[PDB]
Every structure is written in structure tokens, then in C-alpha cells.
Design an enzyme around this catalytic site. Structure first.
Site, mmCIF file in Angstrom:
data_model
loop_
_atom_site.group_PDB
_atom_site.id
_atom_site.type_symbol
_atom_site.label_atom_id
_atom_site.label_comp_id
_atom_site.label_asym_id
_atom_site.label_seq_id
_atom_site.Cartn_x
_atom_site.Cartn_y
_atom_site.Cartn_z
ATOM 1 N N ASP B 50 6.385 -10.591 5.304
ATOM 2 C CA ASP B 50 4.982 -9.881 4.882
ATOM 3 C C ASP B 50 4.472 -9.392 6.533
ATOM 4 O O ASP B 50 5.018 -9.587 7.392
ATOM 5 C CB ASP B 50 3.920 -11.012 4.601
ATOM 6 C CG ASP B 50 2.815 -10.381 3.889
ATOM 7 O OD1 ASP B 50 2.817 -9.003 3.629
ATOM 8 O OD2 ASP B 50 1.930 -11.077 3.656
ATOM 9 N N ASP B 52 0.814 -8.132 7.164
ATOM 10 C CA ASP B 52 -0.579 -8.448 7.621
ATOM 11 C C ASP B 52 -0.494 -10.059 8.026
ATOM 12 O O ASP B 52 -0.111 -10.834 7.156
ATOM 13 C CB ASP B 52 -1.534 -8.227 6.862
ATOM 14 C CG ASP B 52 -1.976 -6.690 6.685
ATOM 15 O OD1 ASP B 52 -1.737 -5.867 7.617
ATOM 16 O OD2 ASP B 52 -2.518 -6.113 5.653
ATOM 17 N N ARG B 142 -10.913 -27.063 -9.989
ATOM 18 C CA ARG B 142 -10.636 -25.795 -9.273
ATOM 19 C C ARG B 142 -9.870 -24.882 -9.969
ATOM 20 O O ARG B 142 -9.943 -23.742 -9.846
ATOM 21 C CB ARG B 142 -9.834 -26.367 -7.981
ATOM 22 C CG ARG B 142 -8.601 -26.478 -8.170
ATOM 23 C CD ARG B 142 -7.691 -26.452 -6.752
ATOM 24 N NE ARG B 142 -6.444 -26.914 -6.704
ATOM 25 C CZ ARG B 142 -6.138 -28.090 -6.975
ATOM 26 N NH1 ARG B 142 -6.973 -29.118 -7.204
ATOM 27 N NH2 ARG B 142 -5.060 -28.577 -7.014
ATOM 28 N N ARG B 200 -17.367 -9.508 -3.176
ATOM 29 C CA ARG B 200 -16.014 -9.019 -3.182
ATOM 30 C C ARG B 200 -15.653 -7.672 -3.778
ATOM 31 O O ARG B 200 -14.509 -7.354 -2.923
ATOM 32 C CB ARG B 200 -15.621 -10.073 -4.555
ATOM 33 C CG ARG B 200 -14.068 -10.457 -4.965
ATOM 34 C CD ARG B 200 -13.434 -11.480 -4.194
ATOM 35 N NE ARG B 200 -13.102 -11.333 -2.822
ATOM 36 C CZ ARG B 200 -12.327 -10.221 -2.368
ATOM 37 N NH1 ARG B 200 -11.673 -9.671 -3.358
ATOM 38 N NH2 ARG B 200 -12.331 -10.039 -1.148
ATOM 39 N N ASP B 204 -13.100 -5.469 -0.985
ATOM 40 C CA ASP B 204 -11.869 -4.573 -1.387
ATOM 41 C C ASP B 204 -12.000 -3.069 -1.443
ATOM 42 O O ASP B 204 -11.336 -2.458 -0.693
ATOM 43 C CB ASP B 204 -12.143 -4.566 -3.240
ATOM 44 C CG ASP B 204 -11.467 -5.943 -3.556
ATOM 45 O OD1 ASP B 204 -10.752 -6.844 -2.669
ATOM 46 O OD2 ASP B 204 -11.566 -6.056 -4.763
ATOM 47 N N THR B 247 5.795 -5.887 1.739
ATOM 48 C CA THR B 247 4.360 -5.778 2.009
ATOM 49 C C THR B 247 3.638 -5.342 1.104
ATOM 50 O O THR B 247 4.136 -4.387 0.461
ATOM 51 C CB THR B 247 4.024 -5.318 3.523
ATOM 52 O OG1 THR B 247 2.607 -5.214 3.815
ATOM 53 C CG2 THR B 247 4.340 -3.725 3.586
ATOM 54 N N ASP B 349 1.917 -15.310 5.763
ATOM 55 C CA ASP B 349 0.798 -16.051 5.872
ATOM 56 C C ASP B 349 -0.407 -16.549 4.642
ATOM 57 O O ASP B 349 -1.144 -17.286 4.712
ATOM 58 C CB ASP B 349 -0.336 -15.248 6.814
ATOM 59 C CG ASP B 349 -0.876 -14.149 5.906
ATOM 60 O OD1 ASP B 349 0.174 -13.168 5.375
ATOM 61 O OD2 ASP B 349 -2.174 -13.825 5.599
#
Ligand SMILES: [Mg+2]
Ligand SMILES: [Mg+2]
Ligand SMILES: [Mg+2]
Ligand SMILES: [Mg+2]
Lengths: 470, 470, 470, 470
Positions: B50, B52, B142, B200, B204, B247, B349
């Protein structure tokens, strides 16, 4: 000596409740409670149970063999060939938690990451290189539930063996042509998927519409472990907390089985008046429909205990003495017993449907009963020198050392049966083992092992450190 | 000293590739690769990345602070009160992996089982007894994704702090009335859920339509870690295997960032001709749309690298030199590189979206980059005496010992920030830590740490035993 | 005189196939085929049939009364009160196509737009103003299928009456308290929705597991219309095209019923050798699972006609003489008969499940059998002066004229039964009527009426003009 | 003379409100309201409106041509070939309600039953026999929404023509190879489906992010029909009932358009003070998101009318003067205006999204504006001799008569354009015509035609009889 022979042998012994007798007894591996995460028994206010393979442990291989025979007869009844009648259940073949691959008709033993440990097509055990043709990465996506069915319950043991019998039979019977995804019989094609569905439907039928329950009940001594220590442990739980039953079974069957489990000429201890099974429970709930029970569930109903039939309508009334519930949800239980999740120790054998879901959806404390452990522990201890040698070889490597690692892996695994240990193949843990570790706070061959620990024992597991913390 | 200060400090050092220099260097915790499951590097044929926070590590707190400032300005722009402009990003507050509870407007730090470790309402840290009013079992489900949002990425750090700022602001501003599930402003009601959605949406927007990319690119030295050892490591990977990029970013941004990462007056080593970034990759894929990429994905497209625009239609041709792909799926990569899953080490990550999914869906080997580790390790080692004391207290207990356990837990955790360590609160591991252990085969503060291990190193982790096996 | 009395009376007459006899016969309303859209019979290459209420027309009220009695006995068997046994089926109450509103426990007769024409709570017919309390817009959203169930089949007639009986019984029985959405019996609450579900489950049970089929078969003369003209018409169809059967029923029941329908001491005409029913069909398909049949369907299976059991596997072979299929899809039929949709006239009674779906999903031509028409036509013609008066009143209006419109509407409707005509309430057409018009190209009381039209008759309907075209 | 030329010509005339002038005016077809179902205007208490193509009728072909030009420029901008720039909008090609078949790249004109009336591939009109290759039953399943897109709005007219332009261009351009399901350009394959998606995305983009709104607003006289009778009619509605606006458009655009529609130097009548557009409405709702609006909708928001931005939070307050709403649901309107469905006449142009859904989901009364009717009526009346001849031929048939039926059908249809009348092809009605009849209670070229009927007019349609009732 089956696992149920071990359990029944231990069941025949009366409880010596002298504190030092208990201390000594629970050092032995067989009578121990194993701890994945620390659990302070003093915080448990409610003890909850499943019935099947928890309170009512069905004797092996007799019960599997009965399931098998009835499933076979059902398939023949709907038009499978007569040759099926010459199959006979073989307890040495199946291990619990295998995956049936419905595309290629294989039984697979996998690790937690979907890596293949064992692959058998019928009774042909397929070696590493030949498995790559169908599994190029020696891997399955176990979340692909249309293709893969995980045979995770003790009720699935007969069909685990039957699936292998059927693939073997069709492969070696000249009337059929073996194809990649099933069998050709002229202008009929039977895919492994449709064959699997027939088997699954037949097992369901045997349990719900056929004669399995009736045959079990007409010979409970043959089919069900009975232990005088059961009432004693439940009485002791009830002295420090509430006790409940939440079972998928119906009331009539539950009553037959539970009456048998408590049929001794005494109550909790010898010399005490016998008490009905229902008096051991603060709350009794049948037709639970777990795992859905741990989410929305179904409407709460009341059982008419004279007739065994549900009363018409949703039950809106309080918890009262003698009431028996049907359906509902895990919240029903919490709210009627005045419990929060972590106040509850839920005791069962279904590692997915009960233990996993009660833990993840509600935060209940969990005790997993693993009946096979009662014999797996004897093999583990008796053949510890094989495992120890395997450990030494992996260490020495970390050429002919690999060959020897494969050979020792084979010999170790064969001590458990053709599909090896429930918990591993050589040094590789199964999916089942990983799930037990992750979701069962405590586990044992029998929940009776709790009898050997004092009222407020602190079950201890070491704190987990990440590699960078170590 | 931020985690990115540590990483950039290590980035400024040239590689000493003398074998003994390497051996000595990777003993230090900072330059180590940590092992959850054994991994034989000799079996890795492809290295995947990836971009970023993996290849392009954004400097802290500068990049979070820019994200924060732009998100705030967007919210003000759509009608949030002017007071938001007086917020300033505070790197000491947020830790990654917190859960926003949209019903009650709390940030929660949880363990793997949903047990509450920390609860903050705005900037008020809520103690054990007061949390029971809203969380009677000190537990959240969750999987209830309509209610709970887990802030698991480094891009979520600014909004983690912003959510707390907003709850604080609205709570203490006399124009609004605080309610259980949000705020009343006369005839308008702003639920914590709708407020969360605005935040959110704004984050974005900042990434996709606003000025974040533009501002990053106009000052890459301020915002992006640069390390001359990057080209050297990638060149070494390419000598023993294939290298690919997959990516979610678009081509134009990828090209700007990657050009900067490779802009040195030399190639892999000082004295060598500079080579374009694209020459380091056997396959380059942008617009990947992970996690969907690991299932069905999207149609494979070809990037016109002159214009930065996609060519019209689905790309049906072979892998060739200079081609850049867009979309596709993880199978595209496998099939074009001639790789099986276990041949691939995927380096990223995103512990959920990439590492978890590539592992579970495809059986890829995984390397998780955890940038914060570069500083968490310094705290862990410098304050080891607090953890050691906590361990001793848990041991001694196994009264005022509990008080002292709470106090030491607090002091330990505060060394990491107001929301404590990414990996634990005192002796209790976070959900994030459990996910790293379960799904990252290897992990480190930087994938550059691979440079310090020989070509075919065998990364080792001890075999796992169940409690009954021990 | 029931509709089935009319049909059986017509069935007892032998066919006079003199061309002028036919011409004269089909002028009469009773023996006519009615045309919604023009249909050139010369273009029909295949004739397809459903069995139940199409080929096998169950006698009224005897068959409804048997269904009713068995459904009642099933409900009592599962714990409904003994008083249910004093209900007796009343053919004067139910009309087909009523909607059960499960929220408020009402039967509703609606138009095509969901406007309420009739509302009954138990046996209380609720007048205009009182219906507004529960239906403020005198309207239901019929697509709200969780709330509204449309009782559209002839098999639903017994449960239409039973639902009303039950609401009446519970309302007037002092043991229960009537509530807005159901009945309270102490700590049990029985919602109209759960009561409805019990009824629906019981009807299903009676058909699939209970004794309805067995009782029908043991007295076919009592329960099933038989007509010597059936074989003659089917033979004539087969001279100009292909003939098929596609029924949801199983093979064993189909064979019993069809054998009875063809059991005469002759074949198509008196003096001809008797031929087995199967010889009248180019293709026979059972277990069709319509409406799904008209989309994806299920796998094609082959019936072993000796045993009545399915052969194991999917059938991959050609159409051959004597083969009987099970499952499949509408495409199976098209492909095996070499037909396009518009080549097929599909003949059935299920206005939704068969006629609507074959038309919309496949473009089949449709013939709807409406058994009740055989008597509705006698009422329509005998009481034409009421309708004519109603027409005149609507015209004169276009005060006490409205009162008189209501009164005449009532008197008209009562001639058909308590729930009025299948096709209208006064001048307002029902949903059912609108569906017939829209989806049945042709319709009649019996498909036997086709016998009275020449081989290549052109059924004509006038071209439709929009208002601005007129 | 376009339909908008007819409407603007009628708009330029002042209202003569003398009762006999009105009576005479509404006899003419052009100024009539057409009636599918009887509607007593006296029962209407609320009048509701959509804006686009209802209140704001965009001039033709100018507005379609602007949409077209901007859509083309967007496609070129994302990489479509430069040749697209040589396309020019041709109003003679498209008729509204065509179906794009994304599998084979055809535009289809269909009847209510999915039967093919016209099929064009690019600009090649495919004759009966050649259509059977792709459509063996001359039928499409219009519910297959992944394959078929119905171009039902006036906003879809430019893309109807563009799709044909593109198929034509790619077919005749030597760089591409025509395939059954799209076009090959070397190693790129562009399916008709992906091409369609690009077009659809580009149209959306032009409306939401591009310059269409801006260009419209900078020349409202060029693009928007304006009529001094609009304020007069709305004022008259408001004297007998409530008036509301429910538009999918945003506030800023709505305000620009509505201000223009009311910008005269007078109010309702000449000599009266001008009043702002908002004063004509009891309730104004923007961002409606129909069709979802007619079910659950979205949260009710309040527009800050100074800024054009939404206030933060859900609006919980009452209807008050000057408030402007955003989002909400159809129930919001009913509840705030104190209306039941049948009290509402909803006036709009979207035969599916508004008229169909308000009728089926809520039982609203419906008035469909069909702008094209304003010119279709002139063709219908001027070429009535062609239709009359066609009627006579169908009658005479009921050989060379068929040939002549085809020829006359062609000549008739060509008077309307290359894709014929919106309402029919020869004697066969379109899907669109059937939907108008079924769901629009009233319809006209313009809702202004209501001005010519007295306050409480009874719009009459004849009662519908089934064939057996006739
Ligand atoms: Mg169980
Ligand atoms: Mg990343
Ligand atoms: Mg039928
Ligand atoms: Mg509009």
C-alpha cells in the site's frame, strides 16, 4: 475405551467433598477445568446450561452409530441405492470440525487461517502435491458458506463418516462415472453439493421427524451418561447463585431426558429426599433457537407442562415458580434473573452456536464442554514422547529431517484416529482449537469438574504480551 | 518527539550493509521486525505494498493537524458555529482504534471482547461506576455497526479529536441543551449520530473534493517522511522476487507522492543512476478499492499515464512494461504475477481493510506497518518499571492493592496520552492489539526494518499450546 | 345452486360437435370465452395447464367445508379452545380476494387502488364513518405484505371464513379482553398477526401433512367435477399443437386425480378405446414451485413413476415418451417443446402466481379459469335491473339520491353473499377484477368453453384509446 | 413548432375569466384536462406541485440541446473520442419512454406487456424478422432492471439521442470492432452496459456538478416557459384550499426559477401588487428525494433562506409562516397540512417517481403534466385520417392488407418523429400510455388548463365494465 466410557467411569464414583480430597482430585488432567482467560467464580451470579452434550452426554460410539443407521435408512427410503445398507459406522474415521467441500467432495481439516492440514476424498487421504491441483494455495476461504460446510457439532459425527462412505461408494461403483464435481448415472448428474444437501436434510429429518428421539428414550442407559454428582453440583450452584436451562430442544424431550438424569433414589446427596429436575432451575427455557436467541430471538411463549404444548399467545407475565418458557431471547433471561452478561457463566458444547455467540453478542462468561477431551487427554499424555520428539525436530531444523517431521506427524495423528486430533495435526493447531482458545473462558471434558473447585476459586491464565512487549 | 520524528531520524541514516552491522542493528527494538507467526522469507516470491502510511508516512502531528483544520473549515462552511474555528489539534488526546458510540456521544477504548477500558464524553473521562448507567455490562456489541464506528486508521486521528471537541463544545455552550442522545437548539435537534455523520462526511470531502491533497503536495518535506533506504530495499526485493503496488489512491496523487519518495540524486545506492519510481514495480495498480479488491473487486482498467485519466473500457491485455492498472481484484495480481497467496508478503498499515482481509480472504502473508510503534516502544522501554510494578501487583493479589492497581494503571497509560497506549490499558490488551496479533504475521514501525534481515531469514514465533497441552 | 353445481350440470352434457350446434352454444354467457385482449388461436402452438381448480375443479361448498373442518381440528389439536369445534363452514360469507389486515383483525374488500369497499371485523360490517378511525384515508398500502395478506386463491376460502369466525369468537368470549391489535387472556396476548399466522400454518399443514388429500381421494365423486368433454378437448388441442401440464402438486396426487378425471369407459369420444391420462400430454411436470418456476425455478428432476419418488440427481437428458419431470423452470418447457412465449396459451386459476407471472415474466398468453363465474353470471343476468338502476342513479347524480345509491349498492351486493361479488361492490371494481382484466387475455368459468370455438378462432377485443384520442 | 412553442403561445394570452369564455376555451383539445378516473374537485383540499417540467417547463429543443452539449463535453473530458464533438442534438429522433437494452445496445419502444414495437441499433431501425435473432419472443422482461433502463423523464431525452449517436459512431468508426455486446479497441473492451453507465453518470454530473443550472439561470427566457396565468391559477387554488411545493431541487435553484416564474409587474391579476413566489405556498419543501419521499423519506430539515444552507439538525417545530423545509416525507406534508391522501391533488410530470408512487403508496389524487401532448395533439388531429384508415384496415381484416397495415403504421408514426408517438405505434399502445391511464387521474399538456374549469367541477370518466358484464 471411548471418551464416554471415561466420562461414565468418572460418573460412577461418588463425590468425596472433603476439601483435601477435592484439591488432590483436580490436579489430575482428567478432572481439571482448563483456563483460557482468568475467571473469578465469586463474580458469577448465574449458571446457565444447554442440555444436549452438556447435561445429557450421549454415549459413544453407540449414539453416533444410531444416528448413522437412521440417516442411511432415510436416504435409502428416498431412493439412494440399497448398497448404503451395508455401511457400518466407524468411530475411528471422523474427527469433529472437518469441513466438507461441496465443490470437490472432500473432507478437509484446516487451521484457523484456512490452511489445509488433511484432505480426504472418500477414504483416500490426498498428499501435499496432489492437493495443489484443487487447492493451489493449500487454502480455503472458510467464509464461503455456499461451498464449505463446517461439521462442528457432535451431532455431525455420523454425517462426517457418511459423506466419506458415499463418496467412496459412488467412486467405486461401476454404474456411476466420477466427475470433478460429482457423479454421472446416465442422464442423471449428482453433484457433491446436492448429495451433501440430501445428507444434511436426512440428518435433520432423523432428529425432527424420524425415530432418533424415540429410540434414545426407550433405552436411556444405552445412550445417555448418568452421574449422581450432577444433582449435587447443581444444588451447590443454586446455593450461591441462580441456575437456568436454555435448550434448543422441546419440552417433552427435555422432560424425558432430564427426568432420567435425576432419577436416583435420593436428591443432591445420598440420604436426601429426591426432588424433581425442575426444582434445580430458577428458569427453564426450551425451543430457544440459538444462535438467533442471542440477538432478536423469537416471541416469549409459555409451555403448558401437562400437555407439552405451547399456550396460545405471547407470555407477558413475570417469572414464577413452575413456569416453563419457550423461545424468547438471551435478554429475557437477563432481565428475569436480574443479571448482566458478565454475571453469567454459560455452560455448553456448541463452540459456535452457543459459546462464541453468547461471548460476542452479550459478553457472557463461557464454559465449553468438550466430551472428546476425556479421551484425547489420555492419548496426549500416553504418546507425549511423539509430540516431544516433533517439538525437538522443529527446533533442530530451526533434507531428511523434514521427512522425519512428516512421519512423526503421521504417527502422532493416527493415535487419535484417521482424521487425527480434534485440536491439531502435528504442530499445527486446528480451527477448532483456535476457536476454543478465543471464545471459551474455561473448558473441560465435563462441567462436572467444577465440583472439585471451591465456591469462589479464581481460575487464572497468564497475561498475554505482544511480541514487542516481550 | 513524535513517532514520525523517530522514523525520519532513522530515515536520515545511510544503510551500512556490512552483515555484522545489520545483525547488531536489528537487535535494537526500534529497528526490529516483530513476529506473530513464523515466516520463511525464502518462500516469499512477491512483495506487495500500500502507499499511504506505508511507503508515504505522513509526518505527525503536522498532517493530522492539517486534516483537522480542513475538516473544521468544511463543517463551518456547511453551517456549524464559528466557535469551531477556535479548536486546535491536540496530538496528546487521540489514540488510534477508539470506538465512537453514536447513541451516547462517547469515545470508547475497548478490548477484543467489547469490554470497556476507557470512556470519555467530550473531554470528561468517565469512571467505572458512572459508565454502568449507559453500559450496564461495561460492554458493547462491536458488530452493531449502525451504532458503533471504530476509528481504526491514521486518517481517523483528526476526527477522533474533533468528535471530542464537538461534544465538549455543544455541552458547554449555553445555546444548546444537552440530552441523552444529542443536543437541542430550539426547534432543531442534533443527535450525536447525525453530528458524527457530518464529521465523517466532512473528512471524506476534505480527502476527495477539498484541498488536503493539494496542500500536501505543495509541501512534501513538511508532510511526508523521506528515506534514501527506500529505493535500496525495494531494489533488493526485486532481486529475489516481484514487487507490486496496490493502492486505493488515484494515479495523479500516487505519481506525485512516489516521485517525491524517490527524488534523490541517485538510484538504489549513492553513486548509481537515478531510476523512475515506476521501474521499481513489476505491477502498479491504483484505484484498488480495498477491501472489495480482495473479493469480487471492480473491472480492470488501464491508466493513460500521460493524462492521468482512465482509458475507456475494460483492459483485456497482458502484463506489459509501463502499463498502469486501475481497479481489478487481488486475483488480477496473482494471475498476472503467477503467484499463489502464500507466495505474497503484503505490506500495509490498514489492520482491517488490507491486512485482515488479504489474510482471511486470500491467505496472503502480512506485514503490518504501525507508525506509532516508533514512539510507543520508547515509552514502553523508558517506563518499563511501571508495567513491571503492575505485573507484580496483579501477581501479589493473585483492598488498597486494587486502588494502587488503578493508580499505577492510570500513570502508565498517561505516558502514552490521554487515551493511553494503542495496545493496552494497564494489563488489558486493546481490540487493536488482538487484531495485530491475529492477522499480522509480522509487524514493525516501518517496513524499512526488513532491510536489516538477510535475504532468506526465518522469522520465528514459538508454537502455541492450549492450556490442556501445557 | 353453487358454481360447481353449474359446472357439473354442464359437464354431464355430451359434446354436440356439429358446427352450428357449437356456434349457438357459445353465444350463451355460461359457455362463452371472454376476451380482454385479442388472441388469434391459430398462433397458439402449445397449450399448458395447471391441475388444481383448472383440470380438477373441487366441488363447492363440500371441498371448502372439508378444508375448514380439518384446519379447525388442527388448531384445536395445537391448543386453540374447544369452542372452535362448534364452527360450521358458511359458503354465504366469504368472497375470494379479500385482504386480511393483521394489525386490526379486519377483512377488507378493496379496489385496484387500495380504496376500501367493505370492512368487516369478525361478522360486524363496519360502515363508512367508523372505518375512518382505523383507515383515515379509506385506503391501505397493499404492497405492505407484512401487514396485509390477500386471500386470492380458492384454497383460501375456508381460512377467509375461519378468520372471521375466530375474531368473532374471541371478541364475544368473556375469557378474553378485546384490544386494538388482538386479545388478552391474562398473561398471554394473542395478536391478530400471530392468530393469522397460526391459521395460515394450519391450512398449510392440512394440505401438506394432514388428511386433506387422503379424504379427497377416498371420495373423488363428492369432491371433484368430472366431465367426459375433458378428454375430447385435450385430444383436439393435441391435433393442432403440443399439450403440457405444469403443476405445483406432487406426482402421486396428480396421478390419482388425473386418473379419476379420465376414468370413462372410452377415450376422447364415446366408442373410442380408453387411453391413460399421461398420453394426452407431450410434457408432464410436477412439483413446479410456481411462481419461482417463471424465474430461476429449481433443478430439473425426473420422477420414477413406479414408486412416485424422484430419481437421485439432476436430469440432463432429452424429452422422451413416458418421462415425468419435477421442478425445473418455465424455460425448460419452452426449450423442450421448441416454443416461444407467445406460442403458449397457459390455462390456470391462480391470477397472481400463474397467470400474472407467466404474462409479466415470460410473455405467455393466458387463460384464466374463474370457477365462481359459473354462478356469478347467473346472478348478474337475473339481477341486471339492480345494476341498471345503479347506473341510472350515478348518471342522474352526474341528498337522498346518495342514500338510494348506498341502498341499491347493498341490495345488489347481497345477492352474491355477505362479501358481495368477486368483481365489484356496486359500481366499484375490485382489485381482483382489475387483475383479471390486466393479466388474463381470455377468461371463463371453465376452460372447457374452448371446445365450442373453432380451431383457429380469432378472439377479439376492441382497441383501447386514451381519453385525448377519443 | 415544438410542444414548448405551443405552450408559450398559450402562455402569452391573458386569462379571460368570464364564465362563458372559459366554457368555450376548455372544449378545445389543447386547453382541456383529460380524465382517466372521475375526480370531484370540490373534495380537493390541497394542491401539491413538483417544480421541474411542471411549474418550470423547459423550452424545446433548446434545453435538451444544452443538456446534450454539456453531457458530450463531459464524456470527452473523461476520455471519449473527440469525434463526439461533431454530434448535434436532433429533436426528431428521440421519443420519451424508450428502453435502453444494455446487453445489445438497442433502443426499444415497448407496450405495457414488454412486446417490442420498435427496435433501433444506433440509427438502424431493425425490422420484425431481424429483431427475432436477439429477441426470440419479440419481448423483454422490463423488471430486469440490471439489463433494461427505461428513459422515462424529459431530462432523459438528450441521453436517448446520445446513446444512439454513440452506438452509431462506434459501429462506423474503423478503430473499433463491433461485437454482440459492445466494441473492441485493441486490448480495451467497451460493453454497451459500461458505455451506458458512462452516459448516465455524465448526465448526473452535468445536473449536479456541471454547468447546466448556471447556464439555465443566466438565460431564463431562452430556457423556461413563463406565463402570467400561473400566479392567477395558484391564487385561485389558495382561495379554496392549501397549496404546497415538494421538489427534488435544492433551495437556491428553486428560488431562482420560481422568482423568474413570478416576475411580472403585478401579482395574480394585472393591476395587483406583486407578491413573492413563496407567498403562494402554505408549505415549501425542497430536497424531497422522491420517490423515497413517499415511503420512509429522510429526516426533516429546515432551510436557512438567507444563506441557502440547511440549519444543523432535525426540525422538530410546527408549520410557520416563512419556513422552508428540506427532505422529510409525504406524511410530513399530510400531517402539517391536516390532509388525508384523497384530499390532495398532486401535480407533476414524473409518471413513475411521483405520480405512480403517490397514487400507490399514499392514495393521492394525481394530475400528470405531459408537455409533449401540446404538440402530439396537433399531429393526432391533423393526421386523424391515417389513424382512421388504420382502424378501418384492422376492422376489415377482422395478404396485402397486412403490408398496407404496416405501411400506414409507418407513415402515421413518422409524423411524430423517428421513434413515433409517445403513446402508441399504430394501433398498439406504449407502456407509457398504459401507465398514464392507470396512474394519472387527470392529465394535460399543462396544469394551467385547470384555470378553465370552475371551482368545483366534476371531472367524469365512464364506469369500467368487464367483458362478461358488457
Ligand atoms: Mg448442545
Ligand atoms: Mg494505507
Ligand atoms: Mg391451481
Ligand atoms: Mg419534475
Amino acid at each position: 475405551t471411548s471418551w464416554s466410557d471415561r466420562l461414565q467411569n468418572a460418573a460412577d464414583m461418588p463425590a468425596n467433598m472433603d476439601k483435601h480430597a477435592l484439591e488432590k482430585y483436580r490436579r489430575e488432567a482428567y478432572h481439571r477445568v482448563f483456563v483460557n482467560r482468568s475467571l473469578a467464580m465469586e463474580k458469577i451470579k448465574c449458571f446457565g446450561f444447554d442440555m444436549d452434550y452438556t447435561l445429557a452426554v450421549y454415549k459413544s460410539p453407540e449414539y453416533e452409530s444410531l444416528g448413522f443407521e437412521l440417516t442411511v435408512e432415510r436416504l435409502v427410503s428416498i431412493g439412494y441405492p440399497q448398497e448404503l445398507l451395508s455401511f457400518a459406522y466407524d468411530s475411528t474415521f471422523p474427527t469433529r470440525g472437518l469441513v466438507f467441500d461441496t465443490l470437490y467432495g472432500n473432507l478437509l481439516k484446516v487451521d484457523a487461517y484456512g490452511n489445509l492440514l488433511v484432505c480426504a476424498h472418500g477414504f483416500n487421504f490426498i498428499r501435499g502435491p496432489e492437493t495443489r491441483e484443487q487447492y493451489p494455495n493449500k487454502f480455503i476461504q472458510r467464509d464461503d458458506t455456499e461451498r464449505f460446510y463446517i461439521l462442528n457439532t457432535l451431532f455431525n459425527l455420523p454425517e462426517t463418516y457418511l459423506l466419506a462412505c458415499l463418496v467412496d461408494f459412488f467412486t467405486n461403483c461401476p454404474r456411476y462415472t466420477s466427475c470433478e464435481t460429482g457423479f454421472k448415472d446416465g442422464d442423471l448428474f449428482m453433484s457433491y453439493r446436492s448429495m451433501f444437501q440430501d445428507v444434511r436434510d436426512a440428518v435433520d429429518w432423523v432428529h425432527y421427524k424420524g425415530s432418533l428421539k424415540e429410540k434414545t428414550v426407550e433405552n436411556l442407559e444405552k445412550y445417555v451418561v448418568k452421574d449422581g454428582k450432577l444433582p449435587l453440583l447443581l444444588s451447590r450452584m443454586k446455593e450461591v447463585g441462580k441456575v437456568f436451562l436454555a435448550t434448543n430442544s422441546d419440552y417433552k424431550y427435555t422432560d424425558k431426558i432430564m427426568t432420567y438424569l435425576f432419577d436416583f433414589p435420593h436428591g443432591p446427596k445420598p440420604g436426601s429426599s429426591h426432588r424433581p429436575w425442575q426444582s434445580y432451575f430458577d428458569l427453564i427455557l426450551v425451543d430457544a433457537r440459538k444462535p438467533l436467541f442471542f440477538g432478536e430471538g423469537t416471541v416469549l411463549r409459555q409451555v403448558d407442562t401437562k400437555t407439552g404444548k405451547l399456550k396460545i399467545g405471547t407470555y407477558t407475565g413475570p417469572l414464577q415458580h413452575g413456569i416453563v418458557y419457550s423461545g424468547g431471547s438471551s435478554d429475557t433471561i437477563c432481565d428475569l434473573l436480574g443479571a448482566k452478561g458478565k454475571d453469567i457463566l454459560y455452560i455448553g458444547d456448541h463452540i459456535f452456536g452457543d459459546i462464541l455467540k453468547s461471548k460476542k453478542r452479550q459478553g457472557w462468561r463461557t464454559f465449553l464442554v468438550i466430551p472428546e477431551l476425556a479421551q484425547e487427554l489420555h492419548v496426549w499424555t500416553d504418546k507425549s514422547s511423539l509430540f516431544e520428539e516433533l517439538q525437538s525436530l522443529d527446533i533442530f531444523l530451526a533434507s531428511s529431517i523434514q521427512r522425519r517431521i512428516k512421519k512423526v506427524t503421521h504417527d502422532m495423528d493416527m493415535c487419535y484416529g484417521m482424521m487425527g486430533s480434534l485440536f491439531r495435526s502435528g504442530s499445527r493447531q486446528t480451527l477448532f482449537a483456535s476457536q476454543v482458545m478465543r471464545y471459551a473462558d474455561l473448558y473441560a471434558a465435563s462441567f462436572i469438574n467444577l465440583l472439585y473447585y471451591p465456591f469462589s476459586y479464581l481460575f487464572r491464565a497468564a497475561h498475554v504480551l505482544m511480541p514487542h512487549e516481550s
